[PDB]
Amino acid sequence: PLINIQASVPAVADANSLLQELSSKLAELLGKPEKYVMTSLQCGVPMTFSGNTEPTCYVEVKSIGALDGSRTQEVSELVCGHIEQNLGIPADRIYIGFEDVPARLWGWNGSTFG
Amino acid sequence: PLINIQASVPAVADANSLLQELSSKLAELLGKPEKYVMTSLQCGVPMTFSGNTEPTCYVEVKSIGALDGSRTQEVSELVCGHIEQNLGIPADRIYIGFEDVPARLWGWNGSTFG
Amino acid sequence: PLINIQASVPAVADANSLLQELSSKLAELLGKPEKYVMTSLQCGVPMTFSGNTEPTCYVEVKSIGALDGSRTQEVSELVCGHIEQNLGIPADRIYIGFEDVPARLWGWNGSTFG
Structure with a gap:
């Protein structure tokens, strides 16, 4: 799996920890060995959402399968929750x-x- | 909708204004509430096009539908025009x-x- | 064609040369005029792979066709080799x-x- 985060908020000192935690959580949810999980976090990107520059985030998630049925909902819950908690978005x-x-x-x- | 711009030119002071204008224009063209439009601009990225480093730009556009018939042509006209005018690409x-x-x-x- | 590289390693002084070489090689392999090849390199991005922050890289490749049969394997061999050699990933x-x-x-x- 792959998860790339592009965020409007400033860079965070704990990016590595944040990504490592996201990496293990995503492996478990998708039923993939964590060996194969790739993650990234790019902060400080000029962004708008709903016409304004309040804290906002775009994430891309890719997987070879493992996104059937309720999985995209469950991944979104995980990812949005993790980002809310750790980046304050x-x-x-x-x-x-x-x-x-x-x-x-x-x-x-x-x-x-x- | 989502529009992410990756450009070779240096960062611009009016990134927020540029994106806000792009955001409203894109909402209207796609027939989507602007609430749901997300935009970004990442400048200063090393890029080549046609083998050279002259000003160049990659954009990704995503939408849940609204890209039927002539729409991708019309969006390209809007987006290329906006970027030409505002970034000089x-x-x-x-x-x-x-x-x-x-x-x-x-x-x-x-x-x-x- | 389009090739966008997102890497964890620090920015390199020879990014332009690296991309130009990648650009010509990719044109030849895909059978596309180099005029139409677009490339980018974004270094210094916080990333994990396999749970750790060792040198790692995500690449996106797009083409209008030209990715049939063995082509995605051949492009991967080219791209991974070029990145290994030039970025030490x-x-x-x-x-x-x-x-x-x-x-x-x-x-x-x-x-x-x-």
Whole structure:
């Protein structure tokens, strides 16, 4: 899995801890070995939401499967909650774009997962 | 809707105004309440286009529907025009990646739009 | 084509050269005129992979076609190799997300390729 966060708030000293905690939580929820979870946090990005510059966040989440049924709701609950708590961005100012990526469209280690 | 801009030119003092103007224009064109429009601008990114480092720009645009028929052309005209005017990046050095995202793949406020 | 690199390692003085070399190599592999290749490199991004902050990299690659059969494997070999050599990021800490984008979903020069 992959989770990339782009946030309007200033950079945080505990970015590494925040991402590591997000990484383990996401592995468990998706039923993936944490070995395969990649995360990022880019703060200080000029953003608007609803026409204003209040704290806001865009997240992209990708996985090879594991996003069936209630999973995208459950991931959103996890991710919005984690970001609310750790970055102080209200959940109603967070967007998440999900993609279930075919394994052959996912490169790793000089090849693909397909 | 979502519009994320990644540009090679230096950061601009009027990023907020630029994004707010883009936000209202995009809401109107897509027929979406501006409440739901998210935007970003990341400048100063090392980029090449056509093998050179002249001013260039990558934009991602996402929407839950509203990208039918001539819409992607019309959005491109709006976006390239806005960026040309405000960042001084020629329209022929702007790329836009569009995605019509299913509502269940769009997280917001601890849940999804599906 | 489009290749956007997001890396955890510090910014490099030779980003332009690195991207230009990647640009020509990618054009040749995909059978696209280099005119149409867009690249970027964003370094210094807080990232984890496998739960740790060792050098790691996320790449997105998009093309209008040209990603059939063995192509995504071949692109991954090229890209992981180039990044390993130039940024010192091990290939086993590199992820690549691929998308074959319909031409009508690819904006350029105030219109789309469709």
